[PDB]
Symmetry: D2
């Protein structure tokens, strides 16, 4: 039924999200069980620090979950792009837990980084889609994310499944804390609702197709504004627009600079702002106000029912269900996957 494997894979996300969780979460009793990390959790916690290492969209899934790993575990977590980690020859030691995230399990820079960590005596953990791939075999332990084969040229379902697996890993690490139990239960109940909420978000495709057929087609760049949990989503949206749509895109930390890119943009530059409640900071509102003050006409991804910009000012809304704060990225990325897909179609590009 689908024009392309990429469209199929985006639309497959209710099912891949469920498949990632299948057999791993008891939603009734709120227990996460990751069999691959079985005899290893008590060791993983006993480390100086967690280093998340990955490339491209897999690196963004690490950015998207860093905060919740930090929050739930109180272990320091850093996130490294594999090639830059290697370029810096960043010291790694026996007391580090190195977490490698990869859809393919074959990316050269990820494998080189893994070899570097292994030879230095670090504990290694893989979060990998392709079962038995190099990264899966070579990591000490890990989780196969169970998204199924990905044939689109860019990662869609693997991103949402990686993010979910990383959240389950964070929950697993913090499963002995009385003080975390309410937070755990909140997040696990939220996860249970993700697959159906993804289905809801997919109903935005018509509005997106329309927007992609608009003046948007002709524009040469698109800027995405995000802060907090949604900065990763802004970076991933930009990567998608670049890798798939062959259009220039940058993810911008919203409102960080008063006199940055937003003071420079043309009236008609496409700007997407993430304004869901989890990441609705004063600086986000300032950035959005700055755009509208200059007569810009931004596209706002926000929660159902929220009016971020007055009806008096021209702007586009793409409304998404509200979920638990640290899970909102799973829903907010979907319109970007669809926008990047339909822009590439509007332009004649093959995405498989």
């Amino acid at each position: 039924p689908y024009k392309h494997f990429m469209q199929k894979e985006i639309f497959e996300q209710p099912d891949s999200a469920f498949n990632t969780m299948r057999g791993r979460i008891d939603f009734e009793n709120c227990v996460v069980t990751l069999g691959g990390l079985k005899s290893w959790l008590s060791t993983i916690r006993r480390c100086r620090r967690i280093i998340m290492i990955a490339c491209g969209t897999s690196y963004h899934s690490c950015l998207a979950t860093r905060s919740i790993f930090e929050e739930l575990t109180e272990i320091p977590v850093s996130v490294e792009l594999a090639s830059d980690f290697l370029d810096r020859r960043s010291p790694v030691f026996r007391d580090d837990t190195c977490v490698f995230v990869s859809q393919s399990g074959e990316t050269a820079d990820s494998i080189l980084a893994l070899q570097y960590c292994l030879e230095r005596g670090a504990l290694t953990v893989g979060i990998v889609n392709s079962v038995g791939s190099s990264m899966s075999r070579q990591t000490h332990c890990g989780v196969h994310i169970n998204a199924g084969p990905e044939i689109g040229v860019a990662s869609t379902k693997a991103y949402t499944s990686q993010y979910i697996a990383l959240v389950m890993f964070a929950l697993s690490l913090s499963n002995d804390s009385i003080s975390r139990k309410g937070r755990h239960e909140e997040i696990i109940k939220g996860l249970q609702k993700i697959p159906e909420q993804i289905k809801q978000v997919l109903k935005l495709e018509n509005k997106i197709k329309d927007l992609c057929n608009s003046s948007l087609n002709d524009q040469k760049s698109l800027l995405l504004l995000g802060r907090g949990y949604q900065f990763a989503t802004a970076l991933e949206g930009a990567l998608k627009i670049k890798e798939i749509s062959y259009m220039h895109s940058e993810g911008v930390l919203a409102g960080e600079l008063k006199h940055g890119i937003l003071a420079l943009v043309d009236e008609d530059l496409p700007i997407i702002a993430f304004a869901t409640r989890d990441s609705l900071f004063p600086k986000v509102m300032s950035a959005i106000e700055q755009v509208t003050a200059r007569d810009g006409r931004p596209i706002v991804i926000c929660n159902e029912g929220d009016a971020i910009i007055s009806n008096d000012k021209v702007h586009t809304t793409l409304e998404v269900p509200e979920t638990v704060d640290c899970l909102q990225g799973l829903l907010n990325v979907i319109p970007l996957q669809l926008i990047s897909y339909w822009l590439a179609v509007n332009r004649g590009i093959d995405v498989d």
Copy 2:
């Protein structure tokens, strides 16, 4: 004086500010660094779980620019945080953290809020600050005043190079008990000695940069800066300067990870991916501007801005200077009053 603007003056002041930052703190003959503010705190800093560097804007750049040398010389985990994002994530900190705050003014709101957060959590706090007795200077437990003198220009020029130098001295101080580091120490200190005179030499690129800025470069809507490794910070800081001073969009891009283009191709950061990126550009006849070491031919049409070769971890101090001059002259050519 001879200077059109405060910003131009402060750019040209860098041989002196770089010297002043080192003054009384480095014995170049015996290769000994002595930072009076940190003296009795070093043993405590050396034993922490991790160092978190926390800063905004150009000061965040100076942390990125020196992250690798801290890691290399100390083998302590070092992370670099933008103050607002650190606060947005509510990143946990604890007694065993050493939090290093870098700020020219010592008054930036987000940096102060971040310091107060770390203090309340019981972390050890260290300031690298220009303004003596500012909030950040007072409220950190210990620190180094960078001694760059007052900064009047709207964007940081001398404060970036002086912060970077102060951070390198801090890294050297932390690792001054290591026999295996001694050769690397001496190399960096002998390098630092020559920085002020090398900065004088790089400032002689101004006329070449004026010629470049008189061209259609000054009419462009975007300028991309490509760098990797030590020079990625320099790419980010060049981008920030072009945005903040020249009012032109600019982006610092990690070279070859995935319109005028500036590429950093000095030897310290001349990776395969940089060469690949540069090849991609020349293949489409892109005409890149290449910042490279004196005498190197990185490309067989392009513009070359040659800079003296220094110790790898110090190359960013010389590479940033043409970007400061480009952002300044682009602004002048576009009729912007930089002050």
Copy 3:
């Protein structure tokens, strides 16, 4: 009604034990709250290691509780005699939590050690009986054990009270652990019963006076055998007999040497063996057997109902109630306090 303050203090222990716990343990909800440490616990929970530092009987209360601190917290715990700590110039750093235990809060070696740790930037915690004593003032935080004044020349109720305060501190450090919950509850329900069980143990006094009068008064030395939880009890009993009674005494790790002191003993040298269930190791049984075979007749401290040796093989029994393993030393020490006291008074030695 007491002959000496020391006797009064020994008999005061049901009340001092209760007074130490008062306002600090919710026995129904199994919650421990130590006001003086409350705001400091997350900091202590985080350190590289705990160093317990003390002199004499206070040093023994640290040995008596070292295992339960290690078990409940999984933080390394070492136990230092203050003078030897200072003699070795053991390095201490900002990441150490140094726990100082002292009845008087004034002992020179403990104060010197505290000053050394403070100057090195370590976090310091006091467990002290004398409110506002030097050690109470100078530590960063602490617990006043609330045992009341001791006038006896040797510590009795302050030993049991210190030991209880130390167990409460360990419970407080581990009060966020789901996996520890059952063990927590076990110990707290145990602590609730300690004051009445001490009342029960104190009923051994007449049998102990008989034993001193029939078998011990004329003696020049006595050996205490103990292992595991009861090794500290054996050392403290030895100290009491030395300090109070002016008789030689040695605490011996039971069955450690096949040809050590037990291979050398007479059949009339008095030997006390701790054989309560919590510390009834094979090596303890072997030691006892090495004694009865040599025709030594050991004095066996054991749980009510237990027959450790044959009635065929001659021995004296002092039965004590069974409590939780890590609490059994609180009851096992009491017969030793009473023995040392009666030995002293039967020799016209003042104990106050």
Copy 4:
């Protein structure tokens, strides 16, 4: 020309001390190189703490060297008796470096402790005499102490050889420190002289035989007083007197609350002086192990002196133990005990 393997083994110590160092110390350039640990040191240096785990005399060699490890490395070091470590079910984790010291490499409690540590993911290092014994094989890395086979029933040369191997291990761990370079050179130059100093100490044998011919040999107990570096020597002396001489003995922390007191300069604390003064106040006739030429007790109190050469403070125990080995041996002979 020896009566027993024990006596031979005591007298072999100049050679065993030399053999333990052979090929591992460059005394000219002051460099220690332990082949067995080469590429493991950077990892050993990166642990939360070091736990030294051993039984009997090997436990004492750990006590004897704890201070120098802590001094030189600034890593926390604890010393555990293997059986008690197991009795407590002491938690250990991936970030622990567990160091096992054993002459035989077969002692049951040390083996069980090793297996417990290995199961918990700890890094394990062996300091072992018997090449290819269980503990030699099962530790991740280690140093064979190269003392030669030990046939005496109690450890004599293995103690001084284990102690020297442990000091070399601490030197190796700290070989990157500029601030400790002077202390390193001092210890290494001191190690060079230990073999010939042990020869010197063995010349006390005749004085010791005279002492053991006295009514010392029909005593029921002998107390040994020591503090600091010499507390381990007092504990090891007491063990030797119990295991060999069949006489009760206790090693006592001097001044904490027949007498041999260690009063060498490395461990001449006020509390040691005060303890000795208590004995001479009662005209108790102590036996004093002290450095050559030091008068610890004046001649108006009766006492016996056993002078030993002064070495570097942390090495003094290597010499101070030798008279106790000889005392335990000659007491047994005078008591008709076959020490073998």
